[model samples]
Each structure stands twice: as C-alpha cells, then as structure tokens.
Target: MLVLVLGDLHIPHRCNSLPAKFKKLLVPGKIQHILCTGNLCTKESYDYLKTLAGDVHIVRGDFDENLNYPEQKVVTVGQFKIGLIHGHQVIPWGDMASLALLQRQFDVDILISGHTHKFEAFEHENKFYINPGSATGAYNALETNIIPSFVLMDIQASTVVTYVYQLIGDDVKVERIEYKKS
Candidate 1:
C-alpha cells in the first residue's frame, strides 16, 4: 500500500498554489491514500486531494477558520496504525517527547503531524514518527525558510519504505528512508 502524507497548506494565504515541481511528482492514480495534517483553508484544496487519491484523511490545523474536522485522526494502513495531528496545539511546538506521549495515547505505530512546515521523521522505541511538513511550503512567523515537501510511504507487511520529496528553488530533491515494524 502506498500512502501520501502532506500538510501545512495555508492556501490562498501563504501560497496561491503548490509548486510546479511538486505537482509533477504527484501524478494521480498511483498513490493509494492521502494523510493530510491540514491547514487546508478552502474547500477546493480538499477537492484537489480527492483527485489524487480516493481515500483521504484530514485533521484540523490551528489556522483553520472552520473547526469542523477532527483535531486528530487515526488511520491504519497495512500493518501500521498512524496517528495524525497538526502539531500546533502542543504546549511546545514540534517537540518529540510530547509527540511520543501523543503517539502512545493514540495507540498507533506511527505519529504524523504538521505545523512547523519542516519535514521530519524519526523512530523511537520501536515506533515511527513522521512529519510530512508543508505541501505548499507555507511560512508562519517561526518557520520562515520553508521548502515545499511531502512524504510517500510504500508499506508492505513488515516494512515501510519512505520517499521524501522536497522542492528547493524549482528543483525536486527526492530521498529515500527505510524503516520497519519492530
């Protein structure tokens, strides 16, 4: 199973649209699911995600004018259980230890969150944690120098091979990450 993770889209706020370099890689029909740690301010953005994958999951970001969506969501893909959050509401933003508690509370194998707009991935205590960062390369006060980024996970029965895609000055920089369920 392939899952796409992205978020921190300040749509029509920080960016009018996603970078062209990022769009080239996000060709539809290949990815199985989209897990968005949303700052998706407009309905149109949700429409865009739907076009990419039929199965899309979104959690509420702090900037959202509408709090209709859940603050957190748990999505299970293959053998892993993933917890999704926007990462802003945490007392200290983007702290790993705090997120670790959230992971355990969610009872999931992976914790995915955004807000810092900086892509991050780390494994602690046999569990995995990931932040797909900003899909639109949005910048708030703290995260000034941002890069448009996303993560693609190829999940098999035991391993989740990760692809990190970042758009740096019109160039698409792609990297691979390897992790397993222990």
Candidate 2:
C-alpha cells in the first residue's frame, strides 16, 4: 500500500496553495491513503487532500480551525501502526526528546508529525519518526522561508520504503529511505 504523509499547509493564511510542480505530481489516483499532520486551516485544503486520496487522516494543529479533528491519532496500515500529531504542543517544539515521550505514549511503529516546517526523519529507541515538513512551504513560528516537502511510504508486510519529496527552486528532488520492522 502507498501512503502519502504531509501537513502544515496553513493555506490562505501563511501561504496561498501548494506548489504547481507538486500539484502536478500528486494526482488523484496514485495515492491510497493520506496522513495529514494538520494546520490545513480551512476545509478547502482538506478537500484538496480528498481529491488526491480516499482515506485522509488529519490531527489538529495549533493554528487549525477544525475542532472536530483530534490532537493525536493512530492508524493501522498494512502491518504498521502509525501515530499522527501536529507537534505544536511539544515543549521545545520539534525536539526529539519531546517527540520521544509522545512516541512512547502511542507505542507505535512509526510516528509522524509536522510543525517545524522542516523535513526530518530518524530512528529512536527502535521506532521511526518523521516530519514531512510544510507541504506548501508555509511560514511557521521558527522560520519564514521553508522548504516544501512531503513523504510517501510504500508499505509491505514487514518493510517500508519511504520517499521524501522536496521542492528546491524550480526542481523537485526525491530521496529514498528504507526501514524494516524487527
């Protein structure tokens, strides 16, 4: 299964919309599910994600207006249990220490979050953590200029291959990373 992970759009507030190149690449049919780390801000942005994939899971960010969304959630995809959060409430922001605490609470195989508007991925205590960054390069409390990025995970029974897609200047770059559940 292919899962699209992204968040921190802050649309019509901090930024206008997603990059044209990204829009072109993210067509409706290719993605199976979407894991959004909130800050969509409006229903319009959420609707846009629906156009890309049928199943969209979103957590509430600090700036999000949707109170219906949860602050944190867990979803099972294939053999992986994925935790989703916006990360704005974490002390010291995106620090690994704070995130680790949440990871332990969730007890998930992969924990995904957004808030820093910077792409980050690492393993801690045998679990995976990922921040897909601001998909529209939205301005955050930390930085005004941010890179537009997202992540795609190809999940199998025991292994996951992650592809990080980033927009740099006029070009889109893709980097691959692999993780196996032990």
Candidate 3:
C-alpha cells in the first residue's frame, strides 16, 4: 500500500496552492491512503487531499477550523500502525523527546507529525518518526521561509520505504529512507 503523509498546509492564508511541480507528481489514483498531520485550515484543503486518495485521515491542527477531526489518531495499514498528530501542543515545538513521549502513548510503529514546517525523519528504539513539513510552504511561528515538502510511504508487510519530496526553487528533490519492523 502507498500512504501519502503530509500536513501544515495553511492554504488561502500562508500560501496560495501547492507547488506546480509537486502537483504534477501527486495525481489522483496513485496513492492508496493519505495520512495528514493537519493545519488544512479549510474544507477546500481537505478536499484536495481527497483527490489523491479516498482513505484520508487527518488530525486537528491548532489553526484548523474542522472540529470533526481528532487531535490524535492511530491508523493501521499493511501490518504497521501509524500515529498522526498536528504537534502544536508539544511544548518547545518539534522537540524529539516530546514526540517520543507521544509515540509511546500511541504505541505505534511509526509516528507522523507536523507544525514546524520542516522535514525530518529518524528512528529511535526501533520506531520511525516522520515530519512531512509544510505542503504549501506555509510560514509558522518558528520560521518565515518554510520549504514545501511531503512524504510518500510504500509499505508491504513489515517493511516500508519512505520517499521525502521537497521543492527547491523550480526543482523537486526526492530522498528515500527504509525502515523494517523488528
């Protein structure tokens, strides 16, 4: 299964739309599920994600107006349990220790969160953590010049290969990371 992990798209406020290069790559039917970390801010933003995949899971971001979305959620996909959060409530924003604690609470194999608008992926204690950054390059309290980025995960049984896509000036860069459940 292919899971598209992303968040922090403060659309119609922070930025206008996704980068053209990224939109070209992310067409409908290519992705199986979407795991959004929130800050969609509007129903329009959520609708855009639906164009990519049907099974879209979103958590409530501090700036989001959608009350129906949960603050935190755990989604099961192809033998892996992935936790999603908007991450604004984590004191000292983007702190690894705080995220680790949340990860333990969720009891998930992979934890996905956004809010810093910076892309990050790493592992601790055999678990994976991913921050897909700002899909629209939205400005956050931490930074003004945020880069546009998102993540794609290809999962099969106990392993996953994560592709991180970032836009830098008219070009798109992709980096791959591999994780295997123990």
Candidate 4:
C-alpha cells in the first residue's frame, strides 16, 4: 500500500501554493491514498490534493478555515491502522505524552500529526509517529524558515518503508526510514 501523507499548507494566506519542485514530484496515478494534516485554509488547496489521489483524509488544524473536517481520523491500510491529527487539539503542541494518549484512543499502529512545520519521524513505544511538516513551507507564530516536506509510506504487511521528501535550499532531499510492526 502506498500512502502520501502531507499538510500544514497555509495557502492564500501565508503562502500561495506548494513549491514547484514539490508539485513536480507529486503527480497522479501513483499514490493509493492521501492523508492531510490540515491547515489547507481553502477549498482550492484540498482540490489540489484530490488530484493526486481519490482517497484523501484530512484532520482539522487550528488555522483550517473549513469546519467540515473531523478532529481525528483513523485510516486502515494493509495491516496498519493509522491515526491522523492536526496538533492544535493537543495542549502543548506535539507533546509525546499527549500524542501517546491519542494513539491509545485511536488504537492505531502509526500516528501522524502536523503543526510545528518541522519534519519528525520516530518510533515511540513501538508506535510510529510522523509529522509531515509544512508542505508549502508556510510560517506560523513559531517557525519562520521551515523546510517544505512530506512523507510517503510504502507498507508491505508488517514492514513500512518511510520516505521523507524535503525541500532544502533548491534541492529536494529524500530520506528513508524503516519500521516494522512489533
């Protein structure tokens, strides 16, 4: 299963759209699903993601203008149940304990959230945690010079190959991480 996970796009507000480099790499007919950690801020942004995949899931963020989105989402792919959240609901912003609590509530193998606009992928208590950062590199009240980034997961049964695409300077750097169900 191929899943494209991204978000924190403050489009038409802090930024206009995704970087051309990112847009170039993200095209249709490849990814099976799209999970957005919302801050899209407009319908147009969501439509852009729709072009990439038919199954798109978004969890509301603090800056998300759309009220239709849910606070949390649990998506099942292959043998994994992934949890999606948009950070602001957690009191301290990406706190591990706070995140772990939600992870338990969702009962998912992988938990994803975005808000700090910084990329992070780590395993905690054997549960995978991911933050796709700001795909548009939109600044927040905190981070100013954020790197544009997103994540793609190549899941095969109990193992997952996590790919991180980051726009550093003018180059799109890719990093890989491997995790397995424990």
Runs in model 4 lying further than 4 Å from the true structure: none
- Residue 90, model 1, lDDT: 66
Question: Which ten residues in a row are the worst by lDDT in model 2?
Answer: 90-99
Error of 1 at 49 (Å): 1.0
TM-scores for all candidates: the values are 0.91, 0.92, 0.92, 0.92
lDDT agreement with native, every candidate = 0.77, 0.78, 0.78, 0.78
How many clashes in each candidate?
A: 0, 0, 0, 0
In model 4, the worst 10-residue window by lDDT is 89-98
* Colliding residue pairs in candidate 1: none
Model 4 Cα displacement at 37 (Å)? 1.2
Residue range 82-168, candidate 2, lDDT tens digits: 777887776666565776776667577777777888777877877777877888778777776688876778877877788887777
Model 4 / residue 134 / CA error / Å: 0.6
Q: Model 3: per-residue lDDT, tens digit, 1-182?
A: 87677788777767777887788878888998887777777897878888888888888988888899877666675688777778887776656577667667757777777788877778877788877778888887777777887677787878878877767666778888678977
Model 4, range 33-142, lDDT digits (tens) per residue? 88888788888787887888889888888788889888866677668887778777656666677666667875777777788777777888878788777887788666
- Candidate 1: residue 109 lDDT (0-100): 78
Q: Candidate 3, 155: how far from true, in Å? A: 0.5
Clashes by residue pair, model 3? none
TM-score of 2: 0.92
Give the higher-lDDT candidate: 2 or 3: 2
- Cα lDDT of candidate 1 equals 0.77
TM-score: model 1 vs. ground truth? 0.91
